[model samples]
Target chain A: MRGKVYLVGAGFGGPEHLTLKALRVLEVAEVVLHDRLVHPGVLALAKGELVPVKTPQEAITARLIALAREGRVVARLKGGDPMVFGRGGEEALALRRAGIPFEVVPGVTSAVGALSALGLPLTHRGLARSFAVATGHDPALPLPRADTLVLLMGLKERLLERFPPETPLALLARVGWPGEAVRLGRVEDLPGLGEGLPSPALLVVGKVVGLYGELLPKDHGL
Target chain B: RGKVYLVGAGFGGPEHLTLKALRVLEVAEVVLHDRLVHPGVLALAKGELVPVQEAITARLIALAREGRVVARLKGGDPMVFGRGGEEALALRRAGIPFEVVPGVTSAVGALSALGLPLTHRGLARSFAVATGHDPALPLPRADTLVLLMPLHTLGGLKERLLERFPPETPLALLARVGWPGEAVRLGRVEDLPGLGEGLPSPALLVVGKVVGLYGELLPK
Candidate 1:
């Protein structure tokens, strides 16, 4: 008998953003391995035996495939969408190699979620023509000049080398929560932002940041 | 006071709708949606359904001013080239309260369905999203490229992209994402403009070595 593995996306809303399918999979999964970024509230909603994934990637995949091969229902919950930097394909590939059936459930990636949380748009009529999503934590790469840019992880200082010093930038920290905060400034301010804003922060750059001042109601105090 | 929810429809499949988005639809006073929206998702709306058009931004603000909870339903994630930015800014300028609920983008759905990763540990490190319709849009330099527009004719499109990426780069066309007819065709980068020409609109294109995963992981 072959067992199936469900790759679920917890989304950006923490426990609140999961799809009905994601919730259902969590309800029935026998074993689960979740990412660090997945909200604690979401993990608490799962009925599966939680398996801590502190080991290397190769070891984790081997164990997941082994569990599924033993006819155990394995659910690997991911933070945000499974495809966007969630490494869902790597696990799916391993599962497929072992001939285990698997399915990928999509979630609200940080790119859309972070911007939505900050009331920023990816494609504005005149402000932005196209948007680009890239990670700021990349040790060796810089983003292609995009009309709009969504950078994941912690990137406050290094942005200066890429965009112009006067480049409009907005830092969205801890999107999707009530305390969700944003810092609107130029690229030059990035280096002074320091390291202690928040985790899961996204840096949005482009002319669209100017809209933050234009769109926000004076009383909202966002 | 009425508010607007820029609801993300998640690949136009009802099943892909997030729990929060579904709840919003159930109680919406009015639902304005795109032409390619998922029927099942639209059926959940208990309000007036208006097919979206160019004047959607003004109409949304108008409806909200009349004190109605308007749900702007967009296929896939609202932010991914859906012109959501225009609606958001318009609502803001009009002093209309609005919130964006994130949903699964077509690229995520397609790559996941095909067992492909957007960024791999060593092979690919980053991804970018652009449209094939606008020739002026710069070809992204990320490890993977997610194109929002469909492929009808290669024309000079291939030449424009070749400037940034090599022809050997893989291309995958994802059509009818999250729907029963959902399919993806994997080929070389030069193969795009002709990949899903006959498929209906709202198709997505993914480029990078990640497209190569189909042959490797699927056969296993």
Candidate 2:
């Protein structure tokens, strides 16, 4: 019997953010594999025997295949949309090569999540025509010349000096969590904003940041 | 004041509906939705459904001000191309409480369904999402490009895109994703218009070397 595995992309929301599809998988999972960043609320719902892996790269995939060969339902829960920057692509390819049956369930990437929390949409017709999500650490990665850009793993000095100082920018920290906060400023304002802000954050830059607080209603518990 | 929930249909399918989005729809007093949102998803709402027309911002704000829990449902993520930020700001100006709920963005969903990966180690790096209809915004470059909106309107997508990327670069146009008439057309950047003809609205166009992997990556 060939057991199945699910590459579930867990979103930023707590239990509420967990998709009903993910919940259904959790209830029947016989082997639960989760990332270090998965929300605790989601982890508590797992019905499977918890399986802790040793590493981030190849080790986890090997472990998953070993369990699936046991004919057990394995759930690989990842943070945010697994493919965005989480390397779900590698995992899925590994499964395909192993001839293990699997499914990729997409979730909300953090930048989109921050859009909701910070009251800044990824794209505003008049303000932005496009948006790009890139890693802050990798300068080699092609960063679109002009578009609403969202940087994960925090803002970098390279990003700060790349643009004019007055260019609008904002940092969204810990979205969907209680400590969720949005710090508004510009490219030049980032360094100072960093002293006032912390990590595990998402950064938004470009004209779209100008839309902040424009659509905010009364405070939302989001 | 009433609250507004800016929601998105995961990927044009009922199964893509998030649990949180479902819960809000069930309790919403009214649902102001886009013309293209899944009707099945719209029908799930226990409240009255109002299809948005000419003036949306004013209409949504007015309805929310009436103390109604309004679910403004759009195709894909609210902020992507749905003009959700404008609606969000309008409701904010109306002094109403609102929250944004993330849904399966089209590129994310369609790629998963089609067995295409946005980024792969050395095969690809970064990706960008942009609208083809926006004239002022020049074609964007990245390891991958997810263009929303119909391809026919992309006036100079071929010429401009080729100038930025290799002419031999792979491109895939996924139309009516997750729907009954879903189709995925793959070709080179130079052949985009030929492959994209009458592909329909709400299509997602992906460009890069990653798209070339469709043959190997697509589930057999």
Q: How close is each model in CA RMSD to the real structure?
A: 2.7, 2.5
- The weakest ten consecutive residues by lDDT in model 2 chain B span B133-142
Look at candidate 2 and tell me the lDDT of residue B11.
Answer: 80
- Checking candidate 1 for backbone clashes, the offending pairs are none
lDDT of 1 by residue, A1-222 (tens): 567888878887566678778888999999998887677888998998987565688887887888888898888888877767756777877887777888877777776665664556766767777667777656566655567777877254456555677888877777766566677788877666535677667777877777776643322522
Q: Name the top TM-score candidate.
A: 2
Q: Give residue A46's error in model 1 in angstroms.
A: 1.0
Worst 10 residues of 1 chain B by lDDT: B148-157
What does DockQ give for each predicted structure?
0.58, 0.60
Docking level of model 2: medium
Error of 2 at B69 (Å): 2.1
Best by DockQ: 2
**Chain A (alone) TM-scores for all candidate structures:** 0.88, 0.89
